[PDB]
Amino acid sequence: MEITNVNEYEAIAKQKLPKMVYDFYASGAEDQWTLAENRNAFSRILFRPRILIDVTNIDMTTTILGFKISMPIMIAPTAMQKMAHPEGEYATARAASAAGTIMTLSSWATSSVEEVASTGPGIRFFQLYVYKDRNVVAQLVRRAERAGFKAIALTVDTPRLGRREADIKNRFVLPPFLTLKNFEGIDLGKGLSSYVAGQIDRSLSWKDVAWLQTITSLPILVKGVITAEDARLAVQHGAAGIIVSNHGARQLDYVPATIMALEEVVKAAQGRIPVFLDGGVRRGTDVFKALALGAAGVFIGRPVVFSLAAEGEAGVKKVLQMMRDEFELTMALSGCRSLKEISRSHIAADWD
Amino acid sequence: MEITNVNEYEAIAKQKLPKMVYDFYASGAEDQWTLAENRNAFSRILFRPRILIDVTNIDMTTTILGFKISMPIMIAPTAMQKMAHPEGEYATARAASAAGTIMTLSSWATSSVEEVASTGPGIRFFQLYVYKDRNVVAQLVRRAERAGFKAIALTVDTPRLGRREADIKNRFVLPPFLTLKNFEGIDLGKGLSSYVAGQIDRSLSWKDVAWLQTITSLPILVKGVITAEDARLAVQHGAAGIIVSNHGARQLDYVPATIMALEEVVKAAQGRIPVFLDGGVRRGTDVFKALALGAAGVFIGRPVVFSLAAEGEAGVKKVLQMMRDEFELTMALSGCRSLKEISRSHIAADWD
Amino acid sequence: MEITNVNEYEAIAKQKLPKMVYDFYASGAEDQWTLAENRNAFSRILFRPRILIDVTNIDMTTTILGFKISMPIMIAPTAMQKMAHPEGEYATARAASAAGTIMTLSSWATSSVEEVASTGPGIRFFQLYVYKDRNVVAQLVRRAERAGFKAIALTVDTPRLGRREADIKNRFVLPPFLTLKNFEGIDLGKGLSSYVAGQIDRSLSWKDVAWLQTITSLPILVKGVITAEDARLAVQHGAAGIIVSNHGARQLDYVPATIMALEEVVKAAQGRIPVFLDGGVRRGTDVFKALALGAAGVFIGRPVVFSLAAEGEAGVKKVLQMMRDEFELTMALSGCRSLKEISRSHIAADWD
Amino acid sequence: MEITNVNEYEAIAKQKLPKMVYDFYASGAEDQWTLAENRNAFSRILFRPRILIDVTNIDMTTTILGFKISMPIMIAPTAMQKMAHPEGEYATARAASAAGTIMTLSSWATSSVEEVASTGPGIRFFQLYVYKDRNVVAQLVRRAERAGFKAIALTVDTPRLGRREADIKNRFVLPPFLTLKNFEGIDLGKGLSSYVAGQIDRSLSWKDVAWLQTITSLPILVKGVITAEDARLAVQHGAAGIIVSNHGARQLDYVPATIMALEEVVKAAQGRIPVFLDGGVRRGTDVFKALALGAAGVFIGRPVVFSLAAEGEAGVKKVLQMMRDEFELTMALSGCRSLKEISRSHIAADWD
């Protein structure tokens, strides 16, 4: 009677949201080629069990950046998810909190950093979105101060942002009432929705990456990599953690699938800092893989929204227990007692 | 007027069984990826005939473990097949017996080892299913005593058992009346269906593999391998015969197809002991292949159940003569006079 | 208004013939895998033009076995095609004759070798079909005497004949009235349809291949090869011409596509004798290829029958002018003035 | 409300034109295999971004043959496009002119070289089509005199022209009223539509290529190459610019896709002269690629016609701004400030 498939949701929460909503969450750049190459990508990595072993106990338990995120699956910073159930961002922090992991939110948020954190005690990150003039950035960066956003997911792949068709036919009406309370309205001194669609700096660089550092610590991640030329470059320029990504295949298409493009990104920066790929991932079967390639922990996107929008704080709370309760088969059946015994020593992958 | 296709059955016996039944037999883990990669897998091995030769006579005749199983195709231990025609397990032993091969039954059986063997004279194996406390196991192992189950198909791939979707939506009602008469009801001393779903040991190891040996002989097979790290390991730990498998792709998905994963499993353990892969196999065309790779004889699963459930003792009795009467084209047309002249010397295979 | 596609016919002549008929011509072994791998096979060989050259004149003109078969496309020995328009075999000899090539007919013919040849002056071959006792063979072989069948297409791939599904459900009624006038009725001395399905020798060998030679010359071809172990073997045992084939994918499935399996068959027997692959070929685009791989001339099957059955002597007479009038684009556009300048020097092929 | 997809047009302008029209523009040779291998070809080249860079400014700006074609996308010489909106050829020159690029027209044109050029000031080329007797050619070549067609796209792949099915069933009625005003009617001295289908020389060669040169300069391009044997041959025989092509896959099928066949064509003729591939290209995403392989600028075909036929001078005027406004994402997001920083150093491609 209860129904389990971690995306059986996509389609139910499809009928729950107004065209615009579903398409804002369900898009990809122009041809969207990499959308399905975000799922049918992990299918090109064949398993490789080991057997006749003790599996009474296992161990999802992590420690990313000196943080025990209860289990190795994390949440990726989706834009306005308060449109998809007026709470969203707010109940995701509490959901993850009960779930013991991270609830990562972007600047494009409905609930502000002032606003969400009232949800109380738990680990969470916040996506930086550098703009033209860095006075408002500088203050946003230091907003997630000793409130605690631990790190800052600086998104290096979103200067001019990807051409997801849909939007500009069914012209995305940013819901009149509903607001992006993370800035909600700024200006210098002489607006919302298109303030945010009224600010960013298309020339963000490893020199700005420089500045950001003297304005904080909060472990500055590299969000938006699929190559090793900006990987070794990433250790070359002081940091830890990487958020290898395509942008939910929303910025640029025909750019390799996070998993597929991974080996070269991990293998590049060796032992310096750990990598976390946030994309494609919708089951612990395929989650396993990423962790096999060398990406110590992984985030989650869309799957998390077709859940709140579907059924409140229970929505995502299965998106996480179904997810967690899927990495205890995968780790078990392949002969592993915890992350320690995983690695791509333990498998086979199509291309190779 | 008579209709032949060895799975033309699947679909007829589909309409014969209640949702649950069909789905219990027709499932695979979560995404079921390897389900079709269990058939469209052998299609990646191209034939390689030799011609202008004598084919008046041929030779399916075997001898696996010092047993002439009439012909090289065997039966794989399906769970309750008495649900799918109240007889099942019972009429499969008699069917195979008339068919001269092995009728392999699991612990998850409807008819008990006491019960089925009344069917009379013929070769058959029985799948061991080690549990938490090994007093009931120890006695089950020695149940198939000088009754004669020859070997024991110890299933090394089923600690925590695979997540076949279906079941847990159309919540598998283990048919109130109908019972798993192989244990049927045990307990220590102070139940059925969930006794069996109330017992097993998730820490089965090559140390338990040790014990089993001082409690019997009955040639202890290795059921559930798709790698050569647990293959050489399998000769390292005294035994013969292997039952390379995925579990009807029921335990774990995206783990190579028995045929595909085979070369490394045979090639690993060389000349020590013979290997038998039970999975995917539904025609002697594709049966041939396995035997070409080096797997001396092969078992059969699903195909055997969509036959009893379809048409009694005649059901499977074609599943075997259609099967047998399909290895006498294959062996003939490729220039072979018997198994002796087969081998993967005689072919070509996609990956290679 | 006139419609051209050399198989646009298949489907029209599909609706023209009784189930049995269409399926007798439109079958393949069991799963028929190689049926489409008989067409989507040549699609894995990419073209390779050369340009800015003289193409005022071209040259299909051949000489196979010291025979100028007007153009390089030939006809392959289909069984009873008199069922598919009561004339067939008869009007195919006359059709080819006007078309200047070969009209190859099998022993399974409706019109006898006595019977067809009344059609008059033109080149044609006849498929040998050796049987249990070789007294009737011996006389059939020497039937196509100084009448003129030039060569004998001895079919080395048809001892026990392929399991084309269809037939044995819609039980092939060999049309009561209509007969296989090539033997029509023999017996020793103490019947038709199942005389022929009442005679053959499953032990045909390179020792019988020996005998045949002292009973004739008529250039003994090797029909039914897809490997180089029976190729060099084919020069080892005195002959010329090969008829590399799968049997319209009717004998055995999953055995490579004539084109695909070709390189190794030509490349094997070098300069000794020429090879001709009869299978898959339905356009001069793809015809070209075979000739590129090294198969000096090629035969045609099915395409020739869905034409007589469709529209009399005009049917096949387009199957040949459409075919011929398709090799004068292919040769032209790739920079060639005749066969002399073709070869696989001139192309690219997927596998490679 | 406004709808963007650069071929969302194909289907609208499909319903706008009479069968013949759509099929004249929407055909390909016989099986049309390379039609989709003209699009799903660029999908086998995976992107390869570089990040955290300045993208305030970018640079489509070109200079092909000492010509700043405003942006790197050009127009390919489609036949009668006046059938598809009586203006066509005429409004394409003006469209491109406002768009700052080239408007390339063929001899098969509706509007003559006398006729179109009244449109005024802007860069444009004209496809040469050498005929049997070169008196009319000689005068056409020197027609695009100091009027200014800069170069001459000499089409080396169209002696005997490709067999696009369609046409010859729905027998292409060259619209009675409407004429090919580029010759419109010539004759020696003792007609239209089949004058043009009444003249050409199937023996065009690198010796005629010789002559053409002493009758002009106008940079003689090589239109119709997919190999490096006629590439080095192309520098061997004095010229610049190449127009690597298949002919909209209209001449010959199964001949590699312009992009796919490119590497060998560029890599062959090195630094001698620049190459421009006109085929497949319908987005700046995929446009990028060509330019990555080494083809300095690229032309466009069909996409340009399903636009005039769709909506006048605004039709193509989006086919160019949508196109141009799609190379400013692609160049931006991959880290590039202009063409200078592109190249296939910057990517990954399936085959490799």
Ligand SMILES: Cc1cc2nc3c(=O)[nH]c(=O)nc-3n(C[C@H](O)[C@H](O)[C@H](O)COP(=O)(O)O)c2cc1C
């Ligand atoms: C609605 C939406 C908006 C997005 N906006 C951002 C953003 O503001 N910045 C960013 O770096 N990631 C953004 N993401 C992408 C994610 O943070 C994350 O990479 C992605 O959704 C993971 O892919 P998956 O959905 O297949 O798990 C966006 C994704 C969606 C669904």
Ligand SMILES: Cc1cc2nc3c(=O)[nH]c(=O)nc-3n(C[C@H](O)[C@H](O)[C@H](O)COP(=O)(O)O)c2cc1C
């Ligand atoms: C209904 C069902 C229950 C199964 N239970 C067992 C089991 O108890 N233990 C075991 O090792 N095999 C079990 N198998 C799998 C087989 O023994 C065998 O590997 C498989 O069905 C062969 O795959 P095929 O169905 O494609 O031939 C199960 C299969 C099915 C269909």
Ligand SMILES: Cc1cc2nc3c(=O)[nH]c(=O)nc-3n(C[C@H](O)[C@H](O)[C@H](O)COP(=O)(O)O)c2cc1C
């Ligand atoms: C109806 C039918 C009967 C056949 N019987 C014979 C036969 O008697 N012996 C033989 O060697 N070829 C036989 N062939 C196959 C051909 O001679 C030839 O290899 C084949 O039809 C070429 O394949 P295509 O149909 O794709 O051109 C048969 C084919 C068909 C269609």
Ligand SMILES: Cc1cc2nc3c(=O)[nH]c(=O)nc-3n(C[C@H](O)[C@H](O)[C@H](O)COP(=O)(O)O)c2cc1C
């Ligand atoms: C209707 C039509 C007629 C064509 N005729 C010519 C021609 O006269 N000569 C030539 O070299 N190119 C001709 N082309 C092809 C182009 O010049 C160009 O290579 C092609 O249309 C680019 O392919 P695309 O349509 O996928 O962009 C023809 C194409 C079409 C659509």
